[PDB]
Ligand binder design. Structure first.
Ligand code: NDP
Ligand code: NDP
Ligand code: NDP
Ligand code: NDP
Lengths: 381, 381, 381, 381
């Protein structure tokens, strides 16, 4: 009959109106300052552009071994040129109190050194996966963090991704029933002309082939989806001997794991076949399919039963949670500010590395390897 | 047999490496400065966060009627507090030479005044859809732009969206065959408690109901998908008389159009039913389905023939084109810098408004309205 | 620990075992005998092969005007050659008591005559859609059925299709909320070289173009999905004047309807664009998409809300309901045997024909046509 | 302008018309007579109803150990009661010349005996998967067939399924590129109250657990998709020791295979988790997903690349190929009549059984088993 009060009270003249409804995550502050270490592929395509969507984090400094590249990137991102560092003068960030944390986006073998160096500079450390190339180095990093009284977070972006968290939630709410089979597959074609992949062919830098680089998503994913750790592992690997890419590292590897609950998993990683990021969890009541499972964008999950497929993915007009990149960045910031623990700490990063080494041993010996070593996931999956 | 040269030449020591491969759009500059006018729902959720992904644009100033809100937003976005303006002091932006363009994100009826005022201040104008609430006002805005020797762009985000451009491309490449039927549906539930919707219930501010607000996507979309203009239009509208939201404006309206080619279209808009953004184009060789068609995120297109459904949407790891928000922003910047014309100019915005008025007349009279007035789309669809 | 009793009691020697679990509809009898009238496209591809899946029906006789064709078909289907009739000797089926019903699969204009003739022969009549080409003929058929004390069923296969019934169920269970918008589209390319389509180009035989043939699915579907009848109708039609197929009948037609509940619908039919069978129902809580909506096989339904798409279609190993063809056939049989009414009676067939005529009038005059004539759907939708 | 000749020549009077266009497979004859052996779950739900869609086959006789059940089924299917046999009088089918072949749908361990007995009765044999429970028995069956000069076909329904054949075709046309990874998963929850599953828990009757029953789809499928045989196999199995269903047979088993081409595969079968029939083939150009892969109905295939998913499944109005059941039945008939070889012969059935035994050995020993024994697939995959 008549218009509502709020509609009728709007002026036809230019006037100030209130704060609008948020249908997306809005910015708060830029109180946490980061120093980005290693201006490569992941850093420039994903990390550096992910800072804009953060609610509490900011890019404070850059550490790079390419001066011209660093000067360009600093200009692109509004960083002070006086805040550009190199690998030799790296330790001088300890004098800057505006740098709260350090994000190491270097190649695998150089992770430990710079983490440790950052801990000695009194900084918090966000380190990329995989943690280190050895179990001892993972331990060294943890010890150094403890000694410095700083936080160590591993860059497991899937622990902050909405679709992956949705999947975990429904599994935890018993929608699939009793879990018995998990299947993962993660692959992408290795290109040696790409500079980011050049160190990945080198065993001394990478620390392993496809399992270390992308098989780890299927490995870490299996653990968080099941909410448990494997007690036994078995594996096989093969790479074509005439392929020049696989001289030092593995192309394809298949691993099987047994969990205390009775659950089994079979997974694989590949450097020679196209884009695959597919996870499947089988329960007695339903089956969950994640394809794409661990993408940067467009992840989709589906719960299937006979005659039904219930799918979820991000909405078309709203953004109910923030993206995995911005959320990961803000997570360390929030844990530091609020004095809470980190969801992806160094012990979690150490566990994957230890399991990878066990998988590599099982593939090498051809025997099963016991991995029942009592790792307990702090704060849940 | 042996490793490739580039893999073997990588040092095991920390070293500078080259510029990495881009798999996403990287920043270039921030050479084009914008003044954002109207700090509301669209501005705060979509526009302001879309600036980060631009390659040439930057937020230079803010114009708002809410000072406290403006001070908060400026702080969030790094804007100088000295660059915050209000509606009375709006014309003083002419003194600032760092402000290149003005983006008007005000309610429909206030679009013309501020556009004209910005043209008198020597600025380029990006104006939101729908252009104005009258055809004469659209004309006034165009005249003012011409007189100022400035560019006028209407905020049709779908003209810069990758999935929508993909759809146009395949239609143009004859994948559906000879086109004969188009079906569009755009709807969302109108909430009067939301402040952004309060002016939308008012005829004096909005200039029409659902067709003006969301039916325009289906209308503009039909034209770009077909690549032609309608010569005849017919319509019907209904709103429940006891619903307090539809006292001044229309809830539901259905319109049918005829094109010179022989093609027909049937479409509708609704303020009382949930999220629908679905377009369908029927040809004699294939049928194209766009659902979601005009979302902010997650658009998906599908080409169907018997036994087949070929789908496209954005990739999971790469971002081959930029998003619709950032691209729209950068478009005006690029046209100004490179001296090229704008893809969504004022004449295009004027055409939709003229067609909407014709549709409203046809619904009011119950007779068909001839719309064969010789509009030619400059630069294509 | 030990095996269960039933597993342990199975002999290792060849032995008779029980009746197995049905995961599909099993045969019961062949107690209802049908005479198939008109050995054409629908009859030979869909109807005649659909008898095998019936639980109570059988093909008893064939009536055809092509003797050679009839002799071949009878041999294919195991029908007695003595039970083959022609159009002149049609009435002699009254002497056969093994023929319970007659299924008329003739062209539209010949429906009434043969229905009436079958009623005079004391048979039940299953007649194909559309019922007749006139409202009076529909009435004549109904009167004749009443007088004979026989059942009249119209061949609306979608009233016996599992996916279509599933859709109705969820709408009725309030899963979409309050309904406001329905969109239907039914099309297929008309080929004049096909003999089944040759009578469809003739107005005297077909009784109308695309609306009569395939637009009726969208019309009947709208009514059953909404669970109500339209009180007002509006329409437009166009066919290209140089196209030789559309000299007597319509190619494309778009119709809009208003329901007493407030709901609106917009739909269309086409003879010149490819395979489209798409229905969409918009509510305030959710949106239902049926694509394919009225196929012979592979129908799929989807309930969408932001971030979700819940789909249903037939299961991969089980068949919980019978197919639409067999179920339709068995329906008339079951109503006769159990003395219950038919779900798709002649009054329902008469209603569609009356609405089609109203739609044709509205398209011809260009004015809205009131269709509030008090039709009540007996036994529900 | 004017109507076409064929449309204009149609009479308005009842007249005979030609043979219509087939959009589905029509019947030809019933020249091949089958004797169905074992009236159980598969026979009654899939096989017996699949005869109706055959173009050359017919059910001639029934062999069963349950007389009451056999009498009911014969009546349902129109079989002469004089043609009902039991296991003792089985050999008396040699006197009937109307019985051309025998279809053995008995439990696994009883397959060889009845096949051999049918070969001595001068009949062709269609035998169900898995061929036998031993390699020697498979060999005995082959020898017996050779000696009788009769054909032996194994019931691999997926070799006659349209979606599975479509998948093979595109792989063969190089749409995925160079193949490197195959992943299969086949599972369904084992119910001991179902009589069909009671012999499946018994090792003496079944010959193995899940791999023998459903893992074989993933095993046979991998071979036909790759178009090659494995030279090496590795496996692991686990069943919960307190579960009463898995006392004699395996619940879950995971197997990995290596092919001469370099390709790898990882697959699994399960008796304790719900309906899964998912195959994935990874190439360097694209990835193929089959889900459902080996269903009775509704199989769907999808070719994925970044930003694209091209799907295929059966059409909504046409049926371009016959179903897997009817086609399998007609295949043996056609090979006999036309003197061509069978696509799924005994050597193919023997190969799967030999590979299964090798997989069981590898799981038992925990060592890899060489399977490079020179099997050549006759007539292709
Ligand atoms: N979480 C995830 O999703 C992803 C994680 N990553 C992880 O991030 C890390 C970096 O990967 P990515 O971005 O592909 O690598 P890039 O090779 O593209 O970048 C590594 C950068 O580290 C620096 N660098 C320093 N010393 C060396 C050296 N000896 N050899 C090579 N580079 C050196 C260089 O920076 P500069 O030239 O500026 O000195 C180089 O650009 C890895 O640990 C990887 O596993 C990668 C992709 C995704
Ligand atoms: N292209 C697209 O996808 C979309 C376009 N839009 C278009 O953007 C425009 C703004 O929409 P939306 O963001 O929802 O509107 P909001 O109502 O949320 O924002 C409008 C803003 O304009 C200012 N305003 C000035 N005078 C008035 C007045 N008299 N009444 C109301 N507001 C006033 C206020 O800014 P302040 O308080 O700072 O002074 C207010 O916040 C519309 O033209 C709309 O059609 C909207 C959504 C999407
Ligand atoms: N419910 C549904 O899904 C469908 C329903 N139909 C309905 O079924 C009916 C038949 O359609 P369809 O199978 O395509 O038609 P066809 O033209 O293929 O078959 C009609 C048959 O009717 C007989 N016939 C008798 N007199 C005439 C005449 N003067 N002109 C033409 N045919 C004549 C012929 O049989 P004979 O040669 O043996 O004498 C002819 O084969 C129509 O009412 C149609 O609307 C059609 C398709 C689907
Ligand atoms: N290709 C495929 O898709 C499928 C193949 N199968 C294969 O078909 C076969 C039968 O499976 P299924 O239909 O589930 O089995 P069922 O147990 O349902 O049927 C087996 C039948 O064999 C006869 N039988 C004779 N002796 C015995 C005995 N000692 N124990 C049990 N049954 C006996 C019985 O017939 P009666 O009572 O009449 O004497 C019984 O009904 C198996 O080889 C299976 O692997 C099964 C499903 C699918």
């Amino acid at each position: 009959a008549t218009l509502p009060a709020g509609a009728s009270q709007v002026p036809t003249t230019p006037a100030g109106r209130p704060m609008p409804y948020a249908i997306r995550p809005m910015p708060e502050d830029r109180r946490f300052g980061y120093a980005i270490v290693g201006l490569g592929k992941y850093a420039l395509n994903q990390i550096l552009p992910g800072f804009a969507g953060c609610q509490h984090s900011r890019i404070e400094a850059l550490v790079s071994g390419n001066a011209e590249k660093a000067k360009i990137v600093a200009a692109e991102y509004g960083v002070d040129p006086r805040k550009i560092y190199d690998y030799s003068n790296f330790d001088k960030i300890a004098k800057d109190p505006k740098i709260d944390a350090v994000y190491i986006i270097l190649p695998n073998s150089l992770h430990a050194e710079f983490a440790i160096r950052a801990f000695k500079a009194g900084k918090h450390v966000m380190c990329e996966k995989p943690m280190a190339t050895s179990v001892a180095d993972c331990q060294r990093m943890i010890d150094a963090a403890k000694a410095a009284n700083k936080k160590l977070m591993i860059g497991y972006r899937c622990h902050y991704d909405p679709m992956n968290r949705a999947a975990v939630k429904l599994i935890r709410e018993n929608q699939l029933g009793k879990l018995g089979m998990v299947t993962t597959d993660n692959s992408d074609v290795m290109d040696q002309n790409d500079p980011a992949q050049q160190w990945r062919l080198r065993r001394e830098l990478a620390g392993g082939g496809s399992l270390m680089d992308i098989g780890i998503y299927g490995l870490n994913g299996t653990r968080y989806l099941l909410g448990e750790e494997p007690i036994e592992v078995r594996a096989y690997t093969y790479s074509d001997p005439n392929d020049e890419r696989f001289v030092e590292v593995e192309d394809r590897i298949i691993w099987q794991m047994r969990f205390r609950s009775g659950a089994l998993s079979h997974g694989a990683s590949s450097y020679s076949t196209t884009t695959t990021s597919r996870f499947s969890v089988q329960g007695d009541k339903a089956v969950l399919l994640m394809d794409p499972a661990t993408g940067y964008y467009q992840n989709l999950i589906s719960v299937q039963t006979p005659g039904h497929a219930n799918q979820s993915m991000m909405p078309q007009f709203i953004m109910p949670a923030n993206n995995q990149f911005s959320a990961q960045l803000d997570h360390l910031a929030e844990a530091v500010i609020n004095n809470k623990p980190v969801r992806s700490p160094g012990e979690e990063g150490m566990q994957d590395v230890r399991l990878i080494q066990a998988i590599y041993e099982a593939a090498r010996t051809g025997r099963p390897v016991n991995t029942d070593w009592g790792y307990v996931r702090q704060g849940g999956y």
